[PDB]
């Protein structure tokens, strides 16, 4: 398997790991802060997904310093992972077009 496909797969697995770890850590960081809502694991996982995809509905979000640092890691991991898939798709099209041109 070519590099871009392997890297894409790896990025997906790493993203799932970041989502799970981020969910666990977000609850750890937010409980103890009066008013915080990102405090149970099921909704924290949902929050991690809508954060990684950059949707950000606003139904849930961190209010503490550490919860926000966790959020930044989730954001960057999501953007980087989806960006890498785009890059892999571009490489695929580039390779195919070269062929179609006889190269």
């Amino acid at each position, epitope marked *: 398997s070519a590099l871009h496909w392997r890297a894409a797969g790896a990025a997906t697995v790493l993203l799932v790991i970041v989502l799970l770890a981020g969910s666990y850590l977000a609850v750890l960081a937010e409980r103890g802060a009066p008013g915080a809502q990102l405090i149970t*694991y099921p909704r924290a996982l949902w929050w991690s997904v809508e954060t990684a995809t950059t949707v950000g509905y606003g139904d849930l979000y961190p209010v503490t310093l550490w919860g926000r640092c966790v959020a930044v890691v989730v954001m960057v991991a999501g953007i980087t992972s989806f960006g890498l898939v785009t890059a892999a798709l571009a490489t695929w099209f580039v390779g195919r077009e070269q062929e179609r041109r006889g190269h």
Partner: antibody, heavy 118, light 106 residues
Framework: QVQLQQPGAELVKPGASVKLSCKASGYTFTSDWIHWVKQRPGHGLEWIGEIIPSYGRANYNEKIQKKATLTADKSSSTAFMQLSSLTSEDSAVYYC???????????WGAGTTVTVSS | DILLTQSPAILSVSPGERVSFSCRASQSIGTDIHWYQQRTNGSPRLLIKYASESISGIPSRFSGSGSGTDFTLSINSVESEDIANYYCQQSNRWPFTFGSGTKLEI
């Protein structure tokens, strides 16, 4: 089988401290939190604090004077609540309860009756 | 912190009659409300979770409803064994808080 085991009672002289225990059995997850609740005779339930054994962090009710310090021993699956410098105001039943990180207390211990008297 | 108001503090019903306990939150908490039963000298016992979800082992007689700020715990056809104190508890915001409790009298 009993998921949370707590000693029946503890007599404490005013000013002294005591360490309550809560031995847990059954399924255990990294997402479990052990809570402590205080209930004076004839009164309601008051949340004291919580601790996550897998990490060891504890949080406390800010609305009340802090009398407790929570710890947990992973190898013995036991959670502890150290109550210090007690007065008769601290006399009550202290329950421990388990929450699977999803907001509700799935199960409660039988409670430890603490009496502060000379 | 979220204040949970349970009024009336005492509810008197006749045998076999349907009864409804009230729980009002100081602010909207979605369906993050749970109900517990505590008999004389007993420890609290979970009856309903997330406002209306059944717990295995609890008689079908028990049911819950509501969302937002107003919640209800209902018992269809009350019987002696239901005599106890009932408490609501929220988990929408930190810290978790308890209502002051309602006693069922027959």
């Amino acid at each position: 089988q009993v998921q949370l085991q707590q000693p029946g009672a503890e007599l404490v002289k005013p000013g002294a401290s005591v360490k309550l225990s809560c031995k847990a059995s059954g399924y255990t997850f990294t997402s479990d939190w052990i809570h402590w609740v205080k209930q004076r005779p004839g009164h309601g339930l008051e949340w004291i604090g919580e601790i996550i054994p897998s990490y060891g962090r504890a949080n406390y009710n800010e609305k009340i004077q802090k009398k407790a310090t929570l710890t947990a021993d992973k190898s013995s699956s036991t959670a502890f609540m150290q109550l210090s410098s007690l007065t008769s105001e601290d006399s009550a039943v202290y329950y421990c309860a388990r929450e699977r990180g999803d907001g509700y207390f799935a199960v409660w211990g039988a409670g430890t009756t603490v009496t502060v008297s000379s | 912190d979220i204040l949970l108001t349970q009024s009336p503090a005492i509810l008197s019903v006749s045998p076999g009659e349907r009864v409804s306990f009230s729980c009002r939150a100081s602010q909207s908490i979605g369906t993050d409300i749970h109900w517990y039963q505590q008999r004389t000298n007993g420890s609290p016992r979970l009856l309903i979770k997330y406002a209306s979800e059944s717990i295995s082992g609890i008689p079908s007689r028990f049911s819950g409803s509501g969302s937002g700020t107003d919640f209800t715990l209902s018992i269809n056809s009350v019987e002696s064994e239901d005599i106890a104190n009932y408490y609501c508890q929220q988990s929408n915001r930190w810290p978790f808080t308890f209502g002051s409790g309602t006693k069922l009298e027959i």
